[PDB]
Ligand binder design. Structure first.
Ligand SMILES: C[C@@H]1CCCN(C(=O)c2ccc3nccnc3c2)C1
Ligand SMILES: C[C@H]1CCCN(C(=O)c2ccc3nccnc3c2)C1
Ligand SMILES: C[C@H]1CCCN(C(=O)c2ccc3nccnc3c2)C1
Ligand SMILES: C[C@H]1CCCN(C(=O)c2ccc3nccnc3c2)C1
Ligand SMILES: C[C@H]1CCCN(C(=O)c2ccc3nccnc3c2)C1
Ligand SMILES: N[C@@H](CCC(=O)O)C(=O)O
Ligand SMILES: N[C@@H](CCC(=O)O)C(=O)O
Lengths: 263, 263
């Protein structure tokens, strides 16, 4: 039938989606800026659709409750028909791939460690062998699931510690984890994706850093409900933008060009 | 109908597929070893199929002739029904995605520069601004297409030079490009994927090196003919092997564990 405005679910996560200067006085998509705001515009252009950006109601990426079997976050919004597409730093994972469709990836990342500068930690193994410095992950996302599921000895040991630590080491948003690192005088380290870690490293007050190699290697993809007719065109659009160098230009624009911690 | 042996197309490209010690006396899949031989076994196991490894007849990755519109290489073998799946360092590209199906990627790479140690080149821009050192790419693959298509000034300048250089700067196989670098006393640099570059850097006589950052960022995928029923299971298998850490273990096994240029 007739063309319809595509509902895009996304998440307020710097620098992917941020509230634009003077947003309270603005309406619709003009309220937002960031890597994924730019990426949504480019995809829409190449695919020939109009769209409305919406911020995911529960502020989550997406996990399936083992009791109720219900998905939350952006994944849930796709699964239950509340959005047509997710354009966000949404990690391609096995359990998600079973229930939604994903484009080829538009950005690579791995789990990484964020420390307050000077903290004597260089690796996951270092974290796992000490008790002076607490550490945790985001709730309802792929990093927490990575630890929950890992059979790798070091990561399994870390999960056994994290899942039972009191007070809780988990946070609801990336911003909360970053704030916890910054205020904890070296006594909290945060496990988060390299992309977000490297962004924060270039933001004032320039008091955090990424340490060690990444723990894994994966990608973010644009997601649609399983079988959605939008999927094929969106996937080709990602590959076209990749090949044109536009994704590289956007990463540079939002990570480094406006970095606040020097050249 | 009844289960049938899956024909796998692949390419003799170290360390993805190599001839095993004493192969002349061996038969079938036992003739071969390497990253993709191991990966094929793992995928077959998870997907529940028997398979026969075959080396692509024309020794090419795959390009579409602009005159005849016919695809060659592994892509052609899928497109014309000569193989059921390609398990190889086959780059996911837009023009390929239009004609075959790809899994999510199993390995990341970017175009990179290989030099003979001591060659005074640090970047693509360096290459583009000098005439002492020739440089080229592999035929019938994604690297040559990258330059042919690029609108980025430096890469367009490099293509204008390469496409008309005499004698030809292009090679038929990666091994030929590597040999050309090694024998040319610094006067030839080779543009090839970071994965192959980093492998060769750890092989005797340890006379080459990767210089500069990568020129782009992309992935290899497992390919099937468009619409093949095998695609869904194979894609989940890649994600499962990724998440289990098996792909990382295999990269380490074939690149670094048996590296010949020190620890
Ligand atoms: C199993 C794979 C290991 C390698 C990384 N990966 C990816 O899915 C991946 C690979 C390459 C990419 N290039 C550009 C943007 N996103 C990318 C994501 C997972
Ligand atoms: C073993 C470590 C426990 C945590 C504290 N340590 C640090 O190095 C450390 C690291 C960062 C800091 N930032 C502000 C104030 N104090 C700090 C102390 C030692
Ligand atoms: C060194 C570890 C060996 C295994 C048993 N351990 C723990 O349960 C343990 C206890 C408290 C911690 N607090 C912060 C970070 N990690 C911790 C690990 C300590
Ligand atoms: C400007 C360069 C042109 C090419 C030669 N140059 C080199 O540094 C160079 C680099 C590597 C070599 N390997 C063996 C023998 N000679 C070599 C000379 C200078
Ligand atoms: C410095 C370049 C400016 C533009 C015009 N140039 C060429 O066509 C040019 C000619 C010969 C070359 N031989 C090896 C490598 N690159 C070359 C580039 C030289
Ligand atoms: N990108 C992650 C969220 C961040 C994290 O888990 O560290 C996801 O899609 O679940
Ligand atoms: N991986 C490339 C071949 C190597 C190259 O072009 O450098 C392809 O799939 O075409």
């Amino acid at each position: 039938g007739a063309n319809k405005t595509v509902v895009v679910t996304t998440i307020l996560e710097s620098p992917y989606v941020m509230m634009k200067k003077n947003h309270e006085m603005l309406e619709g998509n003009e309220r937002y800026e960031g890597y994924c705001v730019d990426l949504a515009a480019e995809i829409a252009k190449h695919c020939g659709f109009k769209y409305k950006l919406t911020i995911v109601g529960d502020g989550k990426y997406g996990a399936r409750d083992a009791d109720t079997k219900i998905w939350n976050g952006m994944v849930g919004e796709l699964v239950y028909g509340k959005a047509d597409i997710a354009i966000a730093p949404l990690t391609i994972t096995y359990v998600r791939e079973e229930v939604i469709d994903f484009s080829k990836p538009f950005m690579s990342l791995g789990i990484s460690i964020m420390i307050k500068k000077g903290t004597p930690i260089e690796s996951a193994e270092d974290l796992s062998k000490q008790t002076e410095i607490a550490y945790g992950t985001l709730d309802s996302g792929s990093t927490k699931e990575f630890f929950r599921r890992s059979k790798i000895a070091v990561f399994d040991k870390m999960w056994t510690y994290m899942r039972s630590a009191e007070p809780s080491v988990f946070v609801r948003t990336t911003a909360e984890g970053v704030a916890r690192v910054r205020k904890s005088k070296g006594k909290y380290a945060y496990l988060l994706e390299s992309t977000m870690n490297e962004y924060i490293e270039q933001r004032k007050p320039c008091d955090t850093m990424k340490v060690g190699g990444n723990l894994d290697s994966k990608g973010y993809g644009i997601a649609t409900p399983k079988g959605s007719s939008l999927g094929n065109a969106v996937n080709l659009a990602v590959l076209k933008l990749s090949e044109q160098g536009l994704l590289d230009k956007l990463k540079n624009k939002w990570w480094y060009d406006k970095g606040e911690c020097g050249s």
